[PDB]
Amino acid sequence: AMGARLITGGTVYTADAQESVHARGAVLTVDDKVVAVGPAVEVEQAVQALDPAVRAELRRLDASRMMVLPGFVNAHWHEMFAMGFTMRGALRPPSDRADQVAFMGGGGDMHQISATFDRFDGLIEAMTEDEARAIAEYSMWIQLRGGVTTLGDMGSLNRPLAMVEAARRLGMRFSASTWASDAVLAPDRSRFLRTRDADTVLASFEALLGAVAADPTGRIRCRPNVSYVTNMTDELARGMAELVERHDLPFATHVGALRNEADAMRAYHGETGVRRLAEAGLVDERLMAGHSAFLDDQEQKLMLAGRAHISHSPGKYGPSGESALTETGVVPALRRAGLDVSLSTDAAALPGAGIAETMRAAWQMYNEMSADQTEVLPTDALAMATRIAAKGLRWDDAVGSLEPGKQADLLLVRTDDWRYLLNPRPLESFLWLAGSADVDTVIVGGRTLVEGGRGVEVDEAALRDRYLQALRGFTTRALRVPAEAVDPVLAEVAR
Amino acid sequence: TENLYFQGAMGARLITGGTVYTADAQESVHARGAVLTVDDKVVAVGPAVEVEQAVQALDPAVRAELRRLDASRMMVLPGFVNAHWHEMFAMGFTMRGALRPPSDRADQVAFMGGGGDMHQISATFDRFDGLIEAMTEDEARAIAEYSMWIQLRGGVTTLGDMGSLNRPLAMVEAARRLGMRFSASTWASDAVLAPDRSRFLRTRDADTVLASFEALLGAVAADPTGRIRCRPNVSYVTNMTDELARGMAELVERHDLPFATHVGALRNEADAMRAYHGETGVRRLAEAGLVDERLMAGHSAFLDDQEQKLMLAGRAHISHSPGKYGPSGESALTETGVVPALRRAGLDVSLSTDAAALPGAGIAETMRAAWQMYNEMSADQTEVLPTDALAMATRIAAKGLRWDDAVGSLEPGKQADLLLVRTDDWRYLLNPRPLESFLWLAGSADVDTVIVGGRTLVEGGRGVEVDEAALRDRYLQALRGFTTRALRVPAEAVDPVLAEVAR
Ligand SMILES: Nc1c(O)cccc1C(=O)O
Ligand SMILES: Nc1c(O)cccc1C(=O)O
Ligand SMILES: [Mg+2]
Ligand SMILES: [Zn+2]
Ligand SMILES: [Zn+2]
């Protein structure tokens, strides 16, 4: 048991229903849960109400030189670190001058994207259980280090049980998934090609659900996803709808992500993504739609009528050549209309924008588009990365805000340097001039996992070295990159 | 004399083993590169082994005193050239500042937001001369030195004033004391747009404003450091008479100077310009002879096709500040898309921070913003490459400032103005492009070392000669006096905020 902890004296951002901020606020936790949060004097009354033996062992943390946030909920993420040598990765020349528009850039290479997604099952099968565990634990550590206390898999190039084991070892919360692709859009065909049977794909998810059902930690859940609506048969869509109704689960997919998606969907499936999801019964409160910007008026109305959720990743669109913010403006418009919209990192094969970077991006970019410095307030960017993300993941019963009865998941950020001087809004200074590396302390269920920007039980150097060994094996064996190209890069690593 | 500020010659320095970004004309990047400097200048830059050959060619006495810096765990950048900045820290209590409630929930669209409150902006700018006069020499010195220190700390080695609420000679003295380079200016507003009037109100004589700039130019003509230049500006085309515009054109031709102003900054600007001046900003500048190669235009996004053609024909320069538009409620990137379009058409476009009264986005944050935002708008990850974002904050900015003779790139004969950033942590692991990792996950505070003219001013993220706590405390004392006396904020509101400061 973690017993009682009092974190007192800092600026506390709650992300509660009123987006409450407490200057010189305090948080009292007992075991895994928040018990009191508000002005220091009010929380001191809760301290006096503790069991005497619990009060005797109270851990008092003077956070007067810090800001307190809820733990970040990154509900749209992919484990892709196994592709570090090949995907925008380690073998590129140092000069960027010859870079080309490719993959998700220029409206999207829909054939290449579809084929790449349909290859995941084969590559996951080729990865060893040991490689999967080493790569997952390092990849998920990097999320935790940047303040992500609850992480959502929306389809990973890794083994689901390896990622569950990594989350268990790290102490973070994880919504696990399985890879789901049962169709490919091929250049030499006028219609989708079925690549595997929907019932087998659904059985893979049911096997994961069976494996994590008996989790006693409260830190492991699961959520089925479809990779991308291009790679989704009507049978897979209807099967997902039946599965999430039967098990009372959330559902996630990627839809309306790219300019070129709608034409490819009409050519290969006869209908666009949101309308295909709607026909299957998937456009409802359970849906987290990744990106979801290339929607016509009817699809926007389906999302609003269904009270579906959009996860937006404005920190990473430009470097991918994606245009899911400004080309249509649909996601900010649906948010203004009162659709739930959260912020997520998406992912790549090397470290990219974290939640802190994504919060800055939304604050800058949504506000500039509308000439309105109030459209996304800093506290809105925080809500979008905590409470609203937890609601989309159906984990807001336990996480996403600092309120009595919720899990004691919180971050401390130091505010005593030049960036924060004279600002009564330390979260604003954090969005101007700080990021993932400025997360100092990470607490999950009352347990400190990160302190002073260092792992408490995590050995960062040990996780890194096991990840690099695993990456070497997978890259040379499964991706067939010559050892002659890999080993000199690993020899360069600053240990 | 220079000796008042710093003493001694820097001799030879070899910075070797890191990834070196030159921002030279070829945007050259050297993995395991090196930079050899002698006194104030770069002598050689390239692969470590090639630069070692240049070390062997040094004068023996110079080689005997060579300082070798192991940059193997670092990235080397040119010093940032922030050519569009304002000293505004005197307004820390009033401008999106220290007296706001901690909750942001009641914030309103105001000032620059919602297309721009053109009357309020114009009136605010025209009040600067009175507030600068009200500021004491001691207040000006303390506020300038801390404000400009924060720029230097974030890797700005060359800073351009485009109109400050501070005393010009106080900012020049601050730059001399800090060891950085500075393009000084003077405040220039001779018109205001008032609600109850059919044309602009002339608020002072153009010759007064011109004389103020000529006095600064006279004061810094005698500068022996090579670190101080000056450039006249007009605050904003709203606050500019035809007489001031023509006087500025005559002055920059006679003295062979660059010129800067703000134009096409806001949706509501064009209608206000037509209502009060009979013509929009770029066309008024063009009529005065100011749309030419000397011009650095701040923001410059709300331009019609004819105004875009005037800028291209004149080969003018735009300084863009995409890191800070959203928090001001500005729309100078996406509403028109003009600045990325002019860049694609071959106009010189640089990146700058603009400024506010408290720390905001620095150059590192602005480079990330351009990389994300220009590329997302075009669905093109190659429109602004990371090395383009660096060029826009170094060499191209120096060209717009007319300082590219000496700064903005690591090339033989240019000034030894360099940054080091540590690249040994998780953010950079396996990336052969550390600048890309820096744009993803780092910023101003990750600048480790700052060298100007071969002299280390910042090392391990700390001032070498700067007393950080002392600069801060002098700034806070100066801010207290100015805020209570000149801005008439009650001491009862100011003192509790100063009592809260964490020392
Ligand atoms: N980023 C994506 C995109 O542009 C299209 C389809 C899927 C994704 C993704 O986030 O996996
Ligand atoms: N940011 C500005 C604006 O929006 C209008 C006019 C001037 C400025 C400025 O940068 O000073
Ligand atoms: Mg509008
Ligand atoms: Zn995704
Ligand atoms: Zn400006």
Author numbering:
A (entry chain A): 0 to 494
B (entry chain B): -8 to 494
Q: What's the paper's own text on this?
A:
We reconstituted the biosynthesis of the benzoxazole moiety found in nataxazole by adding two enzymes (NatL2, NatAM), to 3‐HAA, ATP, and Mg2+. We have determined the structures of both NatL2 (homologue of BomJ) and NatAM (homologue of BomN) from the antitumor nataxazole pathway. We show NatL2 catalyzes ester not, as previously reported, amide formation; the amide is a shunt product. NatAM catalyzes benzoxazole from this ester by a mechanism that we propose involves shuttling of protons to control the fate of a hemiorthoamide intermediate.
The structures of NatAM with 3‐HAA (1.25 Å resolution) and 3‐HBA (1.17 Å resolution) were obtained by soaking and show that 3‐HAA and 3‐HBA molecules superimpose, as do the protein structures, which are largely unchanged from the apo. In both complexes, the oxygen atom from the carboxylate coordinates to the zinc ion displacing the water. The other oxygen atom of the carboxylate makes a hydrogen bond to His290, which makes a salt bridge to Asp345. The 3‐hydroxyl group forms a hydrogen bond with Glu321. The 2‐amino group of 3‐HAA bridges the side chains of Asp345 and Glu321. The benzene ring of the acid group sits in a hydrophobic pocket formed by Met103, Phe116, Tyr227, His253, Ala256, and Leu257. The structure of NatAM identifies a water molecule bound to the zinc, but this water is displaced in every complex structure and thus seems unlikely to play a hydrolytic role.
